[PDB]
Design a protein around this ligand. Structure first.
Ligand SMILES: O=C(O)CNC(=O)C(=O)O
Ligand SMILES: [Mg+2]
Ligand code: NI
Ligand SMILES: [Zn+2]
Length: 331
């Protein structure tokens, strides 16, 4: 069995190997990458996502989210308070302001310590989930707006044609902006490219151990757990590495820098934080190996998780028994 300790693997494809996305994902899995839940891909030196980032300031962040925490330093939830619209240029200035800027630090480890110590005492503002792309249309390799669609994958694997579309999302972050513990909708893959700026630290639980994280989360968030049998789908709960280690939960951590891709694998729980002003782009995708995960994915039916139009068909076709209850949650 490849990668039996479920370590995060890092890949350095050549320009020739960067041509065929599906084939490279399958190669990474042949080496056991999926066992970690997360892999890093460093593009060949010949590649670029676009020529410059000098002309992005007029992109609008229509609903910036202020991430307000409740709980204790290592075990907290966050809620998202909607703020007034601002441009990316306005947001970058805000991120660099004395109130919100990254503190002085020695190295990534020192900054990670400061994050876990102090996150709950601040409420950083995240420009998340903005439909759009920063890949140049002429970038032919690993262009996240030109991937094969999940609807086409389901059709190719299972023969059923379904409605829905699959497009990327931009994330503009600042120091302490936070992504809560989650897997993807329908336990899909994700791919995330850090276009610019400061790093993003990731934590991940191997898929084979995801239920260990769920059991801890039910212990640590007991009212949430009573409210919903899949409350990590709400994407609001954080648990620190110190707390995970105290409870024996297997996990790994890695820092993504600008110019690097991360891939999350089906049912790989992940969480993390941004080091300072940055911009990432991400999209979900599928492979043949995903289908069995999609069929088994938990679902939130309490009404909190509210998701895209396109998840309807996935539930309807892969999870027909759950469909009626899940759709009630959506309406
Ligand atoms: O970058 C972020 O805030 C969150 N991204 C992801 O969870 C992802 O790409 O799967
Ligand atoms: Mg612009
Ligand atoms: Ni994710
Ligand atoms: Zn729920």
């Amino acid at each position: 069995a490849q990668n039996p300790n479920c370590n995060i693997m890092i890949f350095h494809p050549t320009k020739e190997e960067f041509n065929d996305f599906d084939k490279y994902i399958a190669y990474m899995e042949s080496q056991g990458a999926h066992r970690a839940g997360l892999a890093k891909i460093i593009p060949p030196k010949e590649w670029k996502a676009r020529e410059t980032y000098d002309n992005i300031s007029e992109i609008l962040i229509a609903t910036p989210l202020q991430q307000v925490a409740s709980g204790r330093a290592g075990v907290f939830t966050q809620y998202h308070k909607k703020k007034k619209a601002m441009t990316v240029g306005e947001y970058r200035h805000l991120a660099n302001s004395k109130k919100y800027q990254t503190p002085p630090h020695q190295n990534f480890e020192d900054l990670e310590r400061k994050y876990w110590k102090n996150r709950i005492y601040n409420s950083p503002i995240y420009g998340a989930d903005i439909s759009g792309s920063l890949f140049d249309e002429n970038t032919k390799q690993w262009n996240l707006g030109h991937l094969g669609t999940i609807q086409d994958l389901l059709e190719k694997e299972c023969g059923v044609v379904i409605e829905g579309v699959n497009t990327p999302y931009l994330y503009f972050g600042m120091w302490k902006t936070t992504f809560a513990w989650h897997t993807e909708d329908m336990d899909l893959y994700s791919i995330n490219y850090l276009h610019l700026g400061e790093p993003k630290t990731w934590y991940v639980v191997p898929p084979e151990h995801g239920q260990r994280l769920e059991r801890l989360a039910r212990e640590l968030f007991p009212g949430s757990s009573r409210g919903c049998g899949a409350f990590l789908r709400h994407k609001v709960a954080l648990i620190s590495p110190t707390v995970l280690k105290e409870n024996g939960i297997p996990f790994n951590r890695i820092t993504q820098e600008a110019g690097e891709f991360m891939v999350t694998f089906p049912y790989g729980y992940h969480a993390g934080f941004n080091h300072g002003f940055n911009c990432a782009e991400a999209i979900n995708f599928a492979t043949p190996r995903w289908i069995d995960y999609g069929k088994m994915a938990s679902q939130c039916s309490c009404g909190e998780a509210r998701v895209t139009f396109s998840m309807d068909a996935f539930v309807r076709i892969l999870q027909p028994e759950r469909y009626d209850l899940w759709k009630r949650g959506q309406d």
